[PDB]
Amino acid sequence: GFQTFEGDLKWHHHNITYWIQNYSEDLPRAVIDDAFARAFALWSAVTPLTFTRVYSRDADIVIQFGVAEHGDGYPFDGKDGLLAHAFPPGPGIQGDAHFDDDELWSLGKGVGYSLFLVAAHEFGHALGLDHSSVPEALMYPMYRFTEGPPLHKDDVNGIRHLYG
Numbered sequence: 001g002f003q004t005f006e007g008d009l010k011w012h013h014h015n016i017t018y019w020i021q022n023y024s025e026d027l028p029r030a031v032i033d034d035a036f037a038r039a040f041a042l043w044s045a046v047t048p049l050t051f052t053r054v055y056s057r058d059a060d061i062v063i064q065f066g067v068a069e070h071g072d073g074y075p076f077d078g079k080d081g082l083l084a085h086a087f088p089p090g091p092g093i094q095g096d097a098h099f100d101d102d103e104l105w106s107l108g109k110g111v112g113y114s115l116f117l118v119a120a121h122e123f124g125h126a127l128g129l130d131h132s133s134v135p136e137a138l139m140y141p142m143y144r145f146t147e148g149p150p151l152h153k154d155d156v157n158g159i160r161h162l163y164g
């Protein structure tokens, strides 16, 4: 099921930093900060990594909301289709996570895509996980809203392969 990028790219330090460069107007700023914090929390529990929010361009994981072509040669596409993308660990753009703000970001059952759930998937990519072929798993490449615990055995096995 689980996959890794073709060098098995991974962080080589334990104290990962992240910077929320900008915000969507879809949700209050404090709701967005907490959504991202909760998504890191899923991953910190199961690895030796910690995640510390910083306010610097030197952060490992830089998080941005953007539309269409937005500075990395991999353009977004308006509403629906692509929701977000992230790059495997390494310097600069690597490890960064981008969210399509042409999408409607929400939490809970209803309109839009759960920022928490999408961020959890994207942060998986930013730690080194590729897509899983196990349909029950967070890294399986289909968004489904759920209230249940996001991590699957396959996700934890994968992240253990990289940091365990």
Ligand SMILES: CC(C)ON(CC(=O)NO)S(=O)(=O)c1ccc(-c2ccccc2)cc1
Residues within 6 Å of the ligand: 081, 082, 083, 084, 085, 086, 117, 118, 121, 122, 125, 137, 138, 139, 140, 141, 142, 143, 144
């Ligand atoms: C299918 C793939 C070509 O496209 N994705 C880009 C990507 O890989 N982002 O990581 S996506 O934006 O549509 C997408 C699809 C599913 C999810 C996802 C899956 C499970 C839970 C939450 C989100 C996130 C983005």
Ligand SMILES: [Ca+2]
Residues within 6 Å of the ligand: 059, 060, 061, 062, 090, 091, 092, 093, 094, 095, 096
């Ligand atoms: Ca980075």
Ligand SMILES: [Ca+2]
Residues within 6 Å of the ligand: 076, 077, 078, 079, 080, 081, 082, 083, 100, 102, 103
């Ligand atoms: Ca889109």
Ligand SMILES: [Ca+2]
Residues within 6 Å of the ligand: 024, 026, 100, 101, 102, 103, 104, 105
């Ligand atoms: Ca939006």
Ligand SMILES: [Zn+2]
Residues within 6 Å of the ligand: 070, 072, 074, 085, 098
């Ligand atoms: Zn991008």
Ligand SMILES: [Zn+2]
Residues within 6 Å of the ligand: 121, 125, 131, 141
């Ligand atoms: Zn993905």
